[PDB]
Enzyme design. Sequence first.
Site, PDB file in Angstrom:
ATOM      1  N   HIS A  29       0.777  -1.239   0.000  1.00 22.50           N
ATOM      2  CA  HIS A  29       0.000   0.000   0.000  1.00 22.50           C
ATOM      3  C   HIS A  29       0.807   1.288   0.000  1.00 22.50           C
ATOM      4  CE1 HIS A  29       0.288   0.114   4.516  1.00 22.50           C
ATOM      5  NE2 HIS A  29       0.182   1.413   4.313  1.00 22.50           N
ATOM      6  N   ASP A  51      -0.815  -7.589   1.777  1.00 28.21           N
ATOM      7  CA  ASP A  51      -0.422  -6.199   1.629  1.00 28.21           C
ATOM      8  C   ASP A  51       1.085  -6.028   1.577  1.00 28.21           C
ATOM      9  OD1 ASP A  51      -0.456  -3.371   1.432  1.00 28.21           O
ATOM     10  OD2 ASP A  51      -0.528  -3.141   3.614  1.00 28.21           O
ATOM     11  N   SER A 103       4.310   2.331   8.649  1.00 30.03           N
ATOM     12  CA  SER A 103       4.155   1.036   7.992  1.00 30.03           C
ATOM     13  C   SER A 103       5.554   0.618   7.515  1.00 30.03           C
ATOM     14  CB  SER A 103       3.184   1.114   6.811  1.00 30.03           C
ATOM     15  OG  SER A 103       3.647   2.030   5.845  1.00 30.03           O
TER      16      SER A 103
END
Length: 152
Positions: A29, A51, A103
């Site tokens: 992402h 992801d 992230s």
Amino acid sequence: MRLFDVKNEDGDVIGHALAMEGKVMKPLHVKGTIDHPVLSKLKFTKSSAYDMEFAQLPVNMRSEAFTYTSEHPEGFYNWHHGAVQYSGGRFTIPRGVGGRGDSGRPIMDNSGRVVAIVLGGADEGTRTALSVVTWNSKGKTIKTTPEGTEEW
């Protein structure tokens, strides 16, 4: 170096990529460029189910790479911002600590081994529950995501 920034056009860090077990890995992402001349040029294999995307590390960065472990007994772990609690199938941190840009960051045991990679989080109770990627004892990839998770 085993942790690298992922940046947008204005040089803002929007996520992180990490060197682990012969691979460079980053949350799918996070659409940006890894701040490294070689890593940003490699061919990545995507895995939207978890992801994430990865590429093979050049043999020379292999020695510098993190080691992964499926051993994540209940207790406290380490990450850039402090402690991460693992309890009842959930990794949690204090409210107001994590956010956009985190992230790609690893959660590590005291031996420095990576037990999980952060994807985002959601406030639950008085803390924040983390959406993460892990691998079990069978080498199976698992994405665990709290409801209403915000991508970081």
